[PDB]
Write an enzyme that holds these catalytic residues in place. Sequence first.
Site, PDB file in Angstrom:
ATOM      1  N   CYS B 149      44.499  48.041  45.492  1.00 58.87           N
ATOM      2  CA  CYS B 149      44.255  46.596  45.506  1.00 58.87           C
ATOM      3  C   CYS B 149      44.916  45.903  44.315  1.00 58.87           C
ATOM      4  O   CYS B 149      45.544  44.857  44.468  1.00 58.87           O
ATOM      5  CB  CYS B 149      42.754  46.294  45.454  1.00 58.87           C
ATOM      6  SG  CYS B 149      41.727  47.287  46.534  1.00 58.87           S
ATOM      7  N   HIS B 176      37.724  43.352  36.899  1.00 61.54           N
ATOM      8  CA  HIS B 176      37.411  43.827  38.235  1.00 61.54           C
ATOM      9  C   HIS B 176      35.942  43.823  38.650  1.00 61.54           C
ATOM     10  O   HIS B 176      35.053  44.168  37.867  1.00 61.54           O
ATOM     11  CB  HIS B 176      37.997  45.238  38.327  1.00 61.54           C
ATOM     12  CG  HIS B 176      38.243  45.719  39.718  1.00 61.54           C
ATOM     13  ND1 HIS B 176      37.229  45.959  40.618  1.00 61.54           N
ATOM     14  CD2 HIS B 176      39.395  46.056  40.349  1.00 61.54           C
ATOM     15  CE1 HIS B 176      37.743  46.429  41.743  1.00 61.54           C
ATOM     16  NE2 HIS B 176      39.055  46.496  41.602  1.00 61.54           N
TER      17      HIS B 176
END
Lengths: 330, 330, 330, 330
Positions: B149, B176
Amino acid sequence: TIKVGINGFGRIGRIVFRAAQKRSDIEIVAINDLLDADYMAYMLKYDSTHGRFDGTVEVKDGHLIVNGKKIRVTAERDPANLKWDEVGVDVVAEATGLFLTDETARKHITAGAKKVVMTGPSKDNTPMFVKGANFDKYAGQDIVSNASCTTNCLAPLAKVINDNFGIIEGLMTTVHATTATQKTVDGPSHKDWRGGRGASQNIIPSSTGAAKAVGKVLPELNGKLTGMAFRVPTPNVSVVDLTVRLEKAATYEQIKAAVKAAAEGEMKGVLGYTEDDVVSTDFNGEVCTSVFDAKAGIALNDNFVKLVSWYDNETGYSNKVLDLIAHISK
Amino acid sequence: TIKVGINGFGRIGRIVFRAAQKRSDIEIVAINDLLDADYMAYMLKYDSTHGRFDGTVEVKDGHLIVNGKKIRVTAERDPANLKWDEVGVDVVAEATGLFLTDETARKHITAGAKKVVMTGPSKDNTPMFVKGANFDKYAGQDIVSNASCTTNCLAPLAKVINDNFGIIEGLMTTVHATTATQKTVDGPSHKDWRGGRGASQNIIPSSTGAAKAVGKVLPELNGKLTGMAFRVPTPNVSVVDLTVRLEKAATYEQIKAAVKAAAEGEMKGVLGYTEDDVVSTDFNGEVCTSVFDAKAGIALNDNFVKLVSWYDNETGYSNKVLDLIAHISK
Amino acid sequence: TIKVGINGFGRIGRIVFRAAQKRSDIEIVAINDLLDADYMAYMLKYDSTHGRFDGTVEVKDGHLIVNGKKIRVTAERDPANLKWDEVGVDVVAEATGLFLTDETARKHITAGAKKVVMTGPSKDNTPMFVKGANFDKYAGQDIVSNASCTTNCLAPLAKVINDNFGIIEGLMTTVHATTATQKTVDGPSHKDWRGGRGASQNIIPSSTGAAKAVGKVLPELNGKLTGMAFRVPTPNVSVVDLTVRLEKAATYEQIKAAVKAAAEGEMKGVLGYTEDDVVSTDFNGEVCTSVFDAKAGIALNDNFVKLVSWYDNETGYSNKVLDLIAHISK
Amino acid sequence: TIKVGINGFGRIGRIVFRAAQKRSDIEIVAINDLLDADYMAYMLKYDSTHGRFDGTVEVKDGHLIVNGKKIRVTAERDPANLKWDEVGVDVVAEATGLFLTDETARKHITAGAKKVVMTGPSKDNTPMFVKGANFDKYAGQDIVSNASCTTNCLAPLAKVINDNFGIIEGLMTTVHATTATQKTVDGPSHKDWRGGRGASQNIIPSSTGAAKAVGKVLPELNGKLTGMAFRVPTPNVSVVDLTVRLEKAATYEQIKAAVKAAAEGEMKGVLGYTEDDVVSTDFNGEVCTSVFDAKAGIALNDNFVKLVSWYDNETGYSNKVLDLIAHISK
């Protein structure tokens, strides 16, 4: 002992108070805020972030009694009416965030206090001081600023790095804990729209001249650093992420050794050092204003590196606010 | 239409499934995981992060029926026993995170499937592809990886920057969101100690070769980027903070214009662009794998800048997993 | 001193260890879990919820040394191979949650230990004991259970209420903190679907026979109480909400006085009492297993009332686990 | 269509606006709050809890344009100066929480509006109405109240239960989501001390006469219900826990059938019913003001039961605010 008065019983005001209880050179004799003494006692006794007050607290006839000593409690909207002299206040910790200019903070001296220490970066020309960076530059001024929490984390680290390898230029990011200025759910924040968005639900980009302000306490770095921040869903403790280009080549091991040396020497007590697998909560209550995380940083090469340093935005700064008070009273 | 089988009904598996329902070129015909069909239907119907499934779902005789179509549900611990051919599976979305090498992922082809797409960076020599970076480099391989990602967020942005101004070197940080591999309270995490600490209570430093991996899909940047991450208490959506030194001087306005141009041109649909006061939740459900935040970045000078780009670590990546499946089936 | 061995170094195991350091009657001499000594030392030293260990900890040649004393560290998957006798373990704190039956917990005695204390409610006929309720009923059994955290909160309060006014019937709810069994994001939880949903994002209904279990330690209440729970996004500390119909009319002031009396008398140290404006974090570290909140409760009439009592699900229970160990060793 | 003006663009104001866009009988023509049109447009476009606005929004010359229609934007501190008649406002949604008495809310009518609907429980004698309970009791009054979110959840359920089995007495608890009145970190809350404690860190006991208020919209239950609440770290969606003693014996299956019957009949659209393993987020966006959770409740016996019902404190209530507006305009 140095008699201190606290204006503003917010997070900073209450934590400087708690930290002061351990000092032997300072004594808080008065507190001013739009809060009754019984409510003030309640805010002091229970703390979601730092736990229960380690001592005694109670209200005896409109007056607060902490650990046996009487504390004057007032609610003056105007500092000039504080009559700090009646209680013998030597230095006042201006922690309301409302009087960050000489003229406004002056009222405290007009009110009977000798000196003032802003618990925030000054908005005018008032001199700022950061322990480990320029406390030695104090020139007897009667009104000073301890700058900001982030600047107190960044400056000490930046000095070690610059002195040892020479910082050509750097950019920093602080992943910062949520603070009182934020909102529980999407709400009004006229001057900073992102800042009004629900704090517990978001990673929120936010501006900050903490990096630029390092150039004030460390003129040699003026114009070489800037940065920004991200407010995240944690109640306390932040961390700085500093990316710098070095003049002199330096392996990561040399960087760690240089920071460790300063933490055990010239900057003992202000700059900390660790090689453990720490996480943010491991620094809740941390007194050092900057704790270098050896294992978290990463270098691309010997002249481009990313350094990481932790700071309890409430505790560290508060302890240095008292350090500055003691220093300007010397 | 392309017949796809999904191995692993975790966050990625369930979101690729949801995103696939809108496609007309692809159809999920089978799902494999150690979950009964009724529980599988429940996980699909209710989602804390993305809300209720927009469609019909039910179990008719040990078999799942989504939006009217029958979906085969199995629970094979070994891919070789999946008999993908019985259901006519063309490509399999390997989303268990357990078979990230050619030999292990091969079992799917041995089981009757034609091609495999790992929903994670490969652990061996298997080729990785990132939309906007190197999908055009696909050479008919029967087993590929869509990388990670973060790499999907970073690569597109890095390409625009490098192509326009030349990246000498860069360091990145990704703030994150919490993921399934983390723990609710301090728990066991043998291989990554920090990673075992309570997710909702901490800012957690974490390693990542997403920055390094950009050098794989964009060989011109090989060895010029690296970085790390901080896991924070949010359920979804992360953000990359990229600090780069540029070969060619470029004002911040020139950088914004270059990124905006790509978002509306060559990288439309993969790279997004905004100048609004956005916060992380504003990208929950975001399909672009990288959304440049114009107002959040900051430049020190025309050759040293800090860029910010958002990404829904669940949705963006999942949509590109399907894009890669459709691309290798062309 | 009583030599204790701990099987399972999870939240309960680590907190009983910490609490034991203050005891003078007990000493932890061994710990067993699938964790190396250095990782074990790390989990002991840093705690997101309770802060850093108040003492010394280090690893000297595959062995843990806490506060100067040597602690044996093993990793036996089968209790029978623990050889507790080699280290002289008197009582073992079975905190894995895997051996909650006589046969399974027996292995510890077969391994050389004299007695066993399950840190969870027994699954078979093994006797359960709750301090303040039935510790005096201990009949020398070599294997016992300290029941559950919620039962330890509810039983003491229920006894005071029943003894004073007679409980005709009651229903309870515990707004419970998130625990290790929950998930950071929507994940697999076969036996309890709601329990797999993201912990930090949800209020999660959950079953519990803690209310029913009160009938075990207090047979006079058998069949008169039951209830359920709601798991919420907090890391520690829960609260019970008990709605009861009373046989004898009792004003709210009489109820408070009765609970206060017990907290300062027969149940001192187990049942606490407060009239302050407390919140959950005010009990992080709380040793009492039940702290009555006077201002939070509310009565409809003199025979139908809703009572509120707090409990640190980690600390309280752990301290009583040690209390039971000391009691069965008398 | 009914022309509506909204005073107060807080959470309720913005969500009633969003929900109104789907109505065909109502049209929002004006909004009043101390916010510029461009900031107002921003708060409408991005929502942390409910996602991006499903439509078009923009500012054309100091005026807001939503989905093509012009919306008047003003900033009057005094309602009397609103000149609602200039824009043709029929009914005004008083959502500031500042004018909850007849005299204060009257200013709106004096300003040109025909009727007023308070989006909160009235502080004086103003009549309150709850859909499913007493909308049929409306007697043409020009100023009304839609009571509170909790009352809207509790009343419908209580009516079904009382009508079918007769409620002798009941006590309720609402595990309530965090709201705008709370604080991000321990802060000042003069009138409600617990309420000032950090919202994301605590389970916070809080008072509420929502249970008592049921006695207003359903006089037959006057004096038979009361209760309290616990604010928890979630951004939206709460749940009521109702413990009641029944006059007529009723098995749990009979209770479920009675509630299901009403949800599909007389109370369709207001009272919902489910038997699924739901969690709080499954109701984010829920229009029904009360959704009975069949599997969560628990009965001790046929005359003492604990019932559970969910409610999106933002969406449900807002939709019924519009329902009341449409009803008093009939």
